[PDB]
Design a protein around this motif. Structure first.
Motif, mmCIF file in Angstrom:
data_model
loop_
_atom_site.group_PDB
_atom_site.id
_atom_site.type_symbol
_atom_site.label_atom_id
_atom_site.label_comp_id
_atom_site.label_asym_id
_atom_site.label_seq_id
_atom_site.Cartn_x
_atom_site.Cartn_y
_atom_site.Cartn_z
ATOM 1 N N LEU A 35 0.817 -1.207 0.000
ATOM 2 C CA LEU A 35 0.000 0.000 0.000
ATOM 3 C C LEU A 35 0.851 1.258 0.000
ATOM 4 N N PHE A 36 0.346 2.301 -0.644
ATOM 5 C CA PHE A 36 1.080 3.553 -0.731
ATOM 6 C C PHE A 36 0.393 4.678 0.041
ATOM 7 N N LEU A 37 -0.784 5.093 -0.408
ATOM 8 C CA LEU A 37 -1.501 6.160 0.289
ATOM 9 C C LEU A 37 -2.002 5.626 1.626
ATOM 10 N N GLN A 38 -1.549 6.257 2.703
ATOM 11 C CA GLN A 38 -1.902 5.855 4.055
ATOM 12 C C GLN A 38 -3.185 6.509 4.562
ATOM 13 N N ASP A 39 -3.178 7.832 4.680
ATOM 14 C CA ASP A 39 -4.365 8.547 5.144
ATOM 15 C C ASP A 39 -4.333 10.011 4.739
ATOM 16 N N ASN A 40 -5.300 10.780 5.239
ATOM 17 C CA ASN A 40 -5.386 12.200 4.912
ATOM 18 C C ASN A 40 -5.371 12.348 3.407
ATOM 19 N N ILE A 41 -5.978 11.375 2.740
ATOM 20 C CA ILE A 41 -6.025 11.359 1.293
ATOM 21 C C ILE A 41 -7.118 12.228 0.709
ATOM 22 N N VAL A 42 -6.689 13.239 -0.032
ATOM 23 C CA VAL A 42 -7.606 14.156 -0.667
ATOM 24 C C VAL A 42 -7.256 14.236 -2.139
ATOM 25 N N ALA A 43 -8.224 13.889 -2.972
ATOM 26 C CA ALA A 43 -8.028 13.896 -4.410
ATOM 27 C C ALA A 43 -8.730 15.087 -5.035
ATOM 28 N N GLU A 44 -8.139 15.607 -6.104
ATOM 29 C CA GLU A 44 -8.708 16.733 -6.824
ATOM 30 C C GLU A 44 -8.792 16.292 -8.276
ATOM 31 N N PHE A 45 -10.013 16.104 -8.759
ATOM 32 C CA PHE A 45 -10.237 15.671 -10.128
ATOM 33 C C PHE A 45 -10.540 16.831 -11.057
ATOM 34 N N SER A 46 -10.082 16.707 -12.294
ATOM 35 C CA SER A 46 -10.312 17.736 -13.291
ATOM 36 C C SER A 46 -10.498 17.075 -14.642
ATOM 37 N N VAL A 47 -11.004 17.845 -15.596
ATOM 38 C CA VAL A 47 -11.193 17.351 -16.947
ATOM 39 C C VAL A 47 -10.871 18.519 -17.867
ATOM 40 N N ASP A 48 -9.926 18.317 -18.778
ATOM 41 C CA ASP A 48 -9.544 19.387 -19.693
ATOM 42 C C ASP A 48 -10.534 19.506 -20.839
ATOM 43 N N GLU A 49 -10.413 20.584 -21.605
ATOM 44 C CA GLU A 49 -11.323 20.830 -22.711
ATOM 45 C C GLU A 49 -11.400 19.688 -23.721
ATOM 46 N N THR A 50 -10.411 18.799 -23.707
ATOM 47 C CA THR A 50 -10.397 17.673 -24.634
ATOM 48 C C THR A 50 -11.176 16.500 -24.050
ATOM 49 N N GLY A 51 -11.703 16.694 -22.846
ATOM 50 C CA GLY A 51 -12.465 15.643 -22.198
ATOM 51 C C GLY A 51 -11.595 14.674 -21.427
ATOM 52 N N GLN A 52 -10.302 14.966 -21.342
ATOM 53 C CA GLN A 52 -9.392 14.095 -20.615
ATOM 54 C C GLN A 52 -9.413 14.378 -19.126
ATOM 55 N N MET A 53 -9.742 13.350 -18.357
ATOM 56 C CA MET A 53 -9.795 13.475 -16.916
ATOM 57 C C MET A 53 -8.407 13.273 -16.342
ATOM 58 N N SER A 54 -8.105 14.023 -15.291
ATOM 59 C CA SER A 54 -6.819 13.931 -14.628
ATOM 60 C C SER A 54 -7.088 14.189 -13.161
ATOM 61 N N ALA A 55 -6.085 13.970 -12.326
ATOM 62 C CA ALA A 55 -6.270 14.197 -10.910
ATOM 63 C C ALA A 55 -4.957 14.361 -10.187
ATOM 64 N N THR A 56 -5.037 14.976 -9.019
ATOM 65 C CA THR A 56 -3.885 15.161 -8.171
ATOM 66 C C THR A 56 -4.400 14.653 -6.843
ATOM 67 N N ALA A 57 -3.491 14.308 -5.952
ATOM 68 C CA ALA A 57 -3.897 13.821 -4.655
ATOM 69 C C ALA A 57 -2.826 14.194 -3.664
ATOM 70 N N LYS A 58 -3.251 14.444 -2.435
ATOM 71 C CA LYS A 58 -2.339 14.790 -1.366
ATOM 72 C C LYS A 58 -2.714 13.897 -0.195
ATOM 73 N N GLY A 59 -1.711 13.446 0.546
ATOM 74 C CA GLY A 59 -1.979 12.592 1.684
ATOM 75 C C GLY A 59 -0.723 11.967 2.248
ATOM 76 N N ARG A 60 -0.866 11.345 3.411
ATOM 77 C CA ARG A 60 0.238 10.676 4.077
ATOM 78 C C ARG A 60 0.511 9.380 3.324
ATOM 79 N N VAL A 61 1.743 9.212 2.861
ATOM 80 C CA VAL A 61 2.116 8.012 2.127
ATOM 81 C C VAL A 61 3.245 7.304 2.857
ATOM 82 N N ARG A 62 3.267 5.977 2.783
ATOM 83 C CA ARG A 62 4.319 5.228 3.449
ATOM 84 C C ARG A 62 5.451 4.926 2.479
#
Length: 174
Positions: A35-62
């Motif tokens: 496992l990688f993401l431990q806790d305090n996991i917050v994801a931010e999803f987005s979609v560009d004008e081309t319809g491509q979805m992407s995301a960033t995430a922040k959190g405690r990782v081991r």
């Protein structure tokens, strides 16, 4: 008891990337091997004008055996024939952070309350998943309402993972 073949798993019908954009707080997670993401996991999803979805995430990782750290992750999703199933290429802002490419399925979501994500990294020879992970997201860090919680529980069971989740806490660690 039921069907645990990954190929039998239903996913979000007509999944809408736009409606899914925004902040999603991981409330629970079923960990994969290593496992990688431990806790305090917050994801931010987005979609560009081309319809491509992407995301960033922040959190405690081991990172190592005994200790963790706060990390920023990035992910780009490649569409597949199924609007709810993606191929997610991810990496950390820090070069040494875990990099990879996992299937990323939006099993279910109502867009403004909850989301159940799933990824089977490796199938067993019988079609069931050998190494999976799943995140239950909430738009509200305080948790899901009872109705959504119950729907999520059903979804978790459909994924044959209901007994394998752990709660993700959000205590401003990062």
């Amino acid at each position: 008891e039921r069907d645990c073949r990954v190929s039998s798993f239903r996913v979000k019908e007509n999944f809408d990337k736009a409606r899914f954009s925004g902040t999603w707080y991981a409330m629970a997670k079923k960990d994969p091997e290593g496992l990688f993401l431990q806790d305090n996991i917050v994801a931010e999803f987005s979609v560009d004008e081309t319809g491509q979805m992407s995301a960033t995430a922040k959190g405690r990782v081991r990172l190592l055996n005994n200790w963790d750290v706060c990390a920023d992750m990035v992910g780009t999703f490649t569409d597949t024939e199924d609007p709810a199933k993606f191929k997610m290429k991810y990496w950390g802002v820090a070069s040494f952070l875990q990099k990879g490419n996992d299937d990323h399925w939006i099993v279910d979501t109502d867009y403004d309350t909850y989301a159940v994500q799933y990824s089977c990294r490796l199938l067993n020879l019988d079609g069931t998943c050998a190494d999976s992970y799943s995140f239950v997201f909430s738009r509200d860090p305080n948790g899901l309402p009872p109705e959504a919680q119950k729907i999520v529980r059903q979804r978790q069971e459909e994924l044959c993972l209901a007994r394998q989740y752990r709660l993700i806490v959000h205590n401003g660690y990062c």
